[PDB]
Design an enzyme around this catalytic site. Sequence first.
Site, PDB file in Angstrom:
ATOM      1  N   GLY C  22       0.457  -1.018  -0.428  1.00 17.51           N
ATOM      2  CA  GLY C  22       0.104   0.206  -0.200  1.00 17.51           C
ATOM      3  C   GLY C  22       0.803   1.277  -0.324  1.00 17.51           C
ATOM      4  O   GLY C  22       1.688   1.589   0.395  1.00 17.51           O
ATOM      5  N   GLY C  25       1.350   1.920   3.722  1.00 13.53           N
ATOM      6  CA  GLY C  25       1.964   1.082   4.175  1.00 13.53           C
ATOM      7  C   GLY C  25       1.529   0.062   3.328  1.00 13.53           C
ATOM      8  O   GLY C  25      -0.195   0.035   2.669  1.00 13.53           O
ATOM      9  N   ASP C 101      -9.766  -9.351  -6.417  1.00 11.01           N
ATOM     10  CA  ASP C 101      -9.954  -7.803  -6.700  1.00 11.01           C
ATOM     11  C   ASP C 101      -9.744  -7.568  -8.784  1.00 11.01           C
ATOM     12  O   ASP C 101      -8.927  -9.075  -8.930  1.00 11.01           O
ATOM     13  CB  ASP C 101      -7.935  -6.995  -6.517  1.00 11.01           C
ATOM     14  CG  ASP C 101      -6.826  -7.544  -7.347  1.00 11.01           C
ATOM     15  OD1 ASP C 101      -7.218  -8.831  -7.392  1.00 11.01           O
ATOM     16  OD2 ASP C 101      -5.800  -6.818  -8.045  1.00 11.01           O
ATOM     17  N   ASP C 141      -9.322   8.134  -8.421  1.00 15.79           N
ATOM     18  CA  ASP C 141      -7.954   7.334  -9.057  1.00 15.79           C
ATOM     19  C   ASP C 141      -8.972   5.997  -8.575  1.00 15.79           C
ATOM     20  O   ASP C 141      -8.746   4.787  -8.561  1.00 15.79           O
ATOM     21  CB  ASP C 141      -6.870   7.002  -7.917  1.00 15.79           C
ATOM     22  CG  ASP C 141      -5.798   6.229  -8.428  1.00 15.79           C
ATOM     23  OD1 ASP C 141      -5.955   6.080  -9.158  1.00 15.79           O
ATOM     24  OD2 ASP C 141      -5.189   5.863  -7.781  1.00 15.79           O
TER      25      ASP C 141
HETATM   26  C1  LIG Z   1      -3.921  -1.867  -1.647  1.00 12.88           C
HETATM   27  C2  LIG Z   1      -4.837  -2.744  -2.659  1.00 12.88           C
HETATM   28  C3  LIG Z   1      -5.762  -3.348  -2.967  1.00 12.88           C
HETATM   29  C4  LIG Z   1      -7.326  -1.944  -2.445  1.00 12.88           C
HETATM   30  O1  LIG Z   1      -6.732  -1.312  -3.312  1.00 12.88           O
HETATM   31  N1  LIG Z   1      -5.735  -4.577  -2.559  1.00 12.88           N
HETATM   32  C5  LIG Z   1      -6.730  -4.616  -1.601  1.00 12.88           C
HETATM   33  N2  LIG Z   1      -7.305  -6.578  -1.662  1.00 12.88           N
HETATM   34  C6  LIG Z   1      -7.877  -6.516  -0.720  1.00 12.88           C
HETATM   35  N3  LIG Z   1      -8.902  -7.470  -1.348  1.00 12.88           N
HETATM   36  C7  LIG Z   1      -9.010  -8.494  -2.148  1.00 12.88           C
HETATM   37  C8  LIG Z   1      -7.419  -9.084  -2.730  1.00 12.88           C
HETATM   38  C9  LIG Z   1      -6.036  -7.832  -3.691  1.00 12.88           C
HETATM   39  C10 LIG Z   1      -5.061  -9.310  -3.514  1.00 12.88           C
HETATM   40  N4  LIG Z   1      -5.414 -10.485  -2.842  1.00 12.88           N
HETATM   41  C11 LIG Z   1      -4.194 -11.246  -2.317  1.00 12.88           C
HETATM   42  C12 LIG Z   1      -5.805 -12.400  -1.525  1.00 12.88           C
HETATM   43  C13 LIG Z   1      -4.169 -13.483  -1.165  1.00 12.88           C
HETATM   44  C14 LIG Z   1      -3.174 -13.186  -1.664  1.00 12.88           C
HETATM   45  C15 LIG Z   1      -2.338 -12.405  -2.135  1.00 12.88           C
HETATM   46 CL1  LIG Z   1      -1.367 -12.543  -2.830  1.00 12.88          CL
HETATM   47  C16 LIG Z   1      -3.478 -11.402  -2.554  1.00 12.88           C
HETATM   48  N5  LIG Z   1      -6.565  -9.820  -2.104  1.00 12.88           N
HETATM   49  C17 LIG Z   1      -8.631  -5.870   0.579  1.00 12.88           C
HETATM   50  N6  LIG Z   1      -9.694  -5.914   1.370  1.00 12.88           N
HETATM   51  C18 LIG Z   1      -9.146  -4.634   1.791  1.00 12.88           C
HETATM   52  N7  LIG Z   1      -8.934  -4.126   1.480  1.00 12.88           N
HETATM   53  C19 LIG Z   1      -8.587  -2.758   2.187  1.00 12.88           C
HETATM   54  C20 LIG Z   1      -8.722  -1.767   2.226  1.00 12.88           C
HETATM   55  C21 LIG Z   1      -7.481  -2.694   3.806  1.00 12.88           C
HETATM   56  C22 LIG Z   1      -8.238  -4.381   0.769  1.00 12.88           C
HETATM   57  N8  LIG Z   1      -7.247  -4.657  -0.397  1.00 12.88           N
END
Ligand SMILES: CC[C@H](CO)Nc1nc(NCc2ccn(-c3cccc(Cl)c3)n2)c2ncn(C(C)C)c2n1
EC number: 2.7.11.22
Lengths: 822, 248, 321
Positions: C22, C25, C101, C141
């Site tokens: 992030g 962080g 995602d 964004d």
């Molecule tokens: C920060 C960048 C973005 C968000 O803009 N990523 C993201 N993804 C979330 N969940 C889906 C996801 C993406 C990747 N994985 C994943 C799963 C297993 C293994 C691996 Cl290696 C990766 N899972 C998610 N839930 C809550 N938040 C925030 C609001 C704290 C999340 N932020």
Amino acid sequence: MSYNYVVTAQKPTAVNGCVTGHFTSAEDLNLLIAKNTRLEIYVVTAEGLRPVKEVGMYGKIAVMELFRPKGESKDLLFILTAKYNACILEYKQSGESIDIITRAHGNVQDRIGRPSETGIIGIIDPECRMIGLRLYDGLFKVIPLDRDNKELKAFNIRLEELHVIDVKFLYGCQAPTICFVYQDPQGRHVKTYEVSLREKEFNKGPWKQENVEAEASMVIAVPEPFGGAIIIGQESITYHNGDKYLAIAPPIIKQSTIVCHNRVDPNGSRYLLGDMEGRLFMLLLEKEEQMDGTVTLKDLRVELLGETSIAECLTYLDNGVVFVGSRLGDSQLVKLNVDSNEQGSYVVAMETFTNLGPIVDMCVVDLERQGQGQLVTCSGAFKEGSLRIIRNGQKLHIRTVPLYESPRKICYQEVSQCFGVLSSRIEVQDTSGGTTALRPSASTQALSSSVSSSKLFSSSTAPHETSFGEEVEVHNLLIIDQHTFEVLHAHQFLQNEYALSLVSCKLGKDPNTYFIVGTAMVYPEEAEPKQGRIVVFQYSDGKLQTVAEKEVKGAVYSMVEFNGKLLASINSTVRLYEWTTEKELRTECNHYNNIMALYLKTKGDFILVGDLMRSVLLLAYKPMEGNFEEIARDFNPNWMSAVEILDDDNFLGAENAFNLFVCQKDSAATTDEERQHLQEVGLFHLGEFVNVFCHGSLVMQTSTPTQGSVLFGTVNGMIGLVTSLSESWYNLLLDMQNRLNKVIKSVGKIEHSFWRSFHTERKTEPATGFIDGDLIESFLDISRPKMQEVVANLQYDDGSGMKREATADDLIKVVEELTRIH
Amino acid sequence: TKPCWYWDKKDLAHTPSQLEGLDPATEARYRREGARFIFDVGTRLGLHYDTLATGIIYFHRFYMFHSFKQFPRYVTGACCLFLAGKVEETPKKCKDIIKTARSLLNDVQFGQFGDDPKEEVMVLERILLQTIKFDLQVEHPYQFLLKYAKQLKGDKNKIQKLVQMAWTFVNDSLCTTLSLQWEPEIIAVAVMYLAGRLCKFEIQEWTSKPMYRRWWEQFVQDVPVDVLEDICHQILDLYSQGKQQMPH
Amino acid sequence: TESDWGKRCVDKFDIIGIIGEGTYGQVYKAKDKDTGELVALKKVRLDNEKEGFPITAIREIKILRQLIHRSVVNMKEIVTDKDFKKDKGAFYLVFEYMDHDLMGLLESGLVHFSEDHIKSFMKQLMEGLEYCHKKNFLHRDIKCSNILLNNSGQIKLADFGLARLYNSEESRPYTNKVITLWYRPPELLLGEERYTPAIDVWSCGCILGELFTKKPIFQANLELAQLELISRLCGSPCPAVWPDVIRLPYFNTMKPKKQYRRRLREEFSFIPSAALDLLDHMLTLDPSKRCTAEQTLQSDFLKDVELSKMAPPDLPHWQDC
Ligand SMILES: CC[C@H](CO)Nc1nc(NCc2ccn(-c3cccc(Cl)c3)n2)c2ncn(C(C)C)c2n1
């Protein structure tokens, strides 16, 4: 940054397409065979094939068709690559000098489009007026074959039917006409359009749409005497031409899906059909002539001829010689006889062309203790399943062990002087309520046999109805002797149990050497398996004994021995088991942050995990604490097919897009995040699907500049070697590539830099960190004037001198040393 | 879900400051001085009026959980204004706030910032965020004074006089503990009520219900005159105590 | 109480692993020790002490505690690491864990989207955007990486770090380029700086086309090159279609090779008609003529979609293995 070198030890062997024509000379009969990125040109003789020329192209050959436009003496060749590189080629021979001419070339990729489900289709008008391409859903692209279109410029015509199955150009039409099968919610249909180069759009087709079989697969264009088209399905074959409609539905074709067709009689009287079980049929067009003098189609008939290899392409040559191009098994020349033999077959094999087939798994073992290393591969599928023992000899010596069932994984157990091989065979639900095998195979021809009696899943209370005729897989563990390669024992796993992983090792303080198999209970209802087993076997005195079983709540995709412990991946979880003094598996620690943990590799206390979509993760076992720790992960998304550890810092991966990448720890302790980021430092488009990475070399063991040896097997049979370089050696070889690319003429005028660019449907990046060994090794095959042109203004660095001028003779030596690694 | 940020007048006898021996008058003066400090510092930096109020609301809430003897007010004020700038998208660098704070404070006062003014402030940000329970969004009487005034129709000049006089009262209410006692909507009504009395205006006539003598009820439900009088008394007491008089 | 944030310790969560990196962080996946719920913890490090608590995190805390919608990500709480001056520990923003995602699903290539699947996806995204836009908040964004989808088929928006309030009456100076280039509107490429909520609409339209092609529509590396690609499909910026284009700082500076004609309907002929019209309106050059979020919801394509029919996409399964 990281520096690596990739060379092709064995070229692709699977046949991806084959055509006949008059390409080399207007007089000769040619056979052009297309293996992945390789074009082989043959001339047909009365005994077999005479090779004449083989060229490589910087692209996967997707379309290959021969045509002869008015004014040409001989046939021209059209090829389109999977990256949308199009070109028209001509064979030209001046005495002993054979060269391939690029007459027209260009890239036909569209900025916006959806790639079609049934893949790229290419067809050419019978009057050779245009090339039809189906690249994207809802769009039909036309390259008009005018003399001035040297850039192969093209236009798109909007197509209402979004989901097209197959399309061909028709014979006997007043205007260029396409006939195709398409799918919409109401079923599948056959429809026609006319192509107007002048208006650049479709006009109404010669005959109306007809509703066709739900699984209509292929469109055969019938020649001028009959006209119209034939539609091949699973249960029925139909002929369509305006008002005429004939339909034959013989029961023999229902048993196996028909995949390939070819025309025997230029007038269309006879066509050849092949199916997945290898049966070869003759499709006969029975003629009826009216008093008007016109020739109509009276009826259709199918007659079984015999059995061949499961054929990707069939092509009739001359006399009774038919070339069988096989992707799942060995290709063949077979002779068709008018009289059947005493078994009822009209087909007799002439020659067998080695195809390493799909290499699902492989291992390197020095059977003869010759300090060399032999490659035993799981090759082929179904009837063509085989074990192939490969050794370096200048050619490779290959021994074939027929299995007649699909091999899945292989591992060598020296203590028992035998191999353990996982295999699956196809049985069909029969009237008894059980299943019957279509043919005997390795698992049924073992000397001794056993069947699991595990009661773990005997809780049943699960509905799983069976319909007569449906297929099922039956999975077995085969014990095969390392010298005779005879099936010593076959163990059949539980009903609906798939064997996914296999290892041979000792565990804990147990001195016995075991065969350990990880399985998954696969039921059609389940998206992801939720039941599984880890089974410990001991092969002793000709019998396989069940030592222990551990139930798991998922699929044991991968297992690997970890310092006396058993490391297994069950669905998302990666687990470490200890082997107790009671000869049972005991869980020590788990790691759960994986979408699906498909692949596992270990070096020391480090673990590399390959996810379905999350690329690769660097795990570590911390002995002081007795648990796992995440070291770093490749956050960039990739669909893994196989992984390997190169060294303590570099990790190799293969993508489902035919791409290879190398991740390294960022070695920057400024922030913890930097350590946790595996930075992709190498990108390379291999062009092959890598199923297995394996440390080892086949060379009989001068210290080469390359350090390390990783072999990989692919779906098309290609075997390659990955090795590391020093920064100095990489720069030298990379600079040489850029020089070679300006010098070497590519078939189709395809830029080498483009071919090797990392390519997904979504991304395209320039290659980095990889040296195309095949390009470097081609330096030895270019003429002397070109060699000296390449070495002009070349200086070595960081070695004997900071700047050292190189000569064409010096490089001849360097490349020749590089050719000794494979 | 969301925290409760409103206390009863009787509860202010039991702030940490009071229980450490600080008398009511002193804590009141410490709050005015800290509020005016935040107000003056941000004004010199050209900050929006909401940004000043937000910092003051943080400041007033902070000393409902801590004692003035243990946390210097001017450092707290500077920290509040620093955070307020980021919350309200009017950011300033901490060094600039220290620079302005030094300009406006004498040497004894700036001694609170110790040997490293920036550090003392930046360090406090952690405690401030935890104290205000990360409830950063704050509403102020200003937006309601305008939203309600926009629904008044009549003499443009009489209504504008009402708004500015009430607006002045809002600025003055930032020095009092009313921000900790009553929601902003009530404050906006109270200042409109006060200005009306002083200007001898009958606001009901300007409303869509000219015969609804309790004109505020259409803007803020469930507000007795008791509350509006209590608020008016406190604002007027501030003027009576000082040398300053009602703006009029 | 449930509202006293910033005091509970991160000890209460068992850290599973790092889902992603992030901006303020790294984001870690975790499980609550008390309830068992899976959550995502975003580390906020104020130890830098350059400007203290990051504003990007401040924006997300301020905005997401106000916004409550099914298609908006929910911040559950804020927890901390275990002498206030010496304390340099970090804070963690707790969020609901999302299974996948959108960028991941597409980049891996594993997922296949049907028309009905796209309908449910877009309706949820537009409803969330409409909620935020009605509340006068701009995301700024929108990207495939920031769209998060559960296996159930629910879609929530996330990464509001660049989000800010929009004032119609008093347009005020904003940052000139906030959105990622691939999803950046033409107005930001020309430096409008006083951008309207329509900047987010353009991004979501780019996603609409990408869901049909499985490939981002406008992929470039330079701001000018992006305008060229957009110009070829949507038409070149010109006063006839964008009367106020001449007021934009870079209009004369940044010109496409040609004055391309609009070809959107031709190049997207494979898209269904109902969606093609939506794309045409969402990918309109002039922000004043570009459709609003509410208007997208009142389209033939999305108005009659019933959100009870969530229609989950083809998420990873064994047959893909
Ligand atoms: C920060 C960048 C973005 C968000 O803009 N990523 C993201 N993804 C979330 N969940 C889906 C996801 C993406 C990747 N994985 C994943 C799963 C297993 C293994 C691996 Cl290696 C990766 N899972 C998610 N839930 C809550 N938040 C925030 C609001 C704290 C999340 N932020």
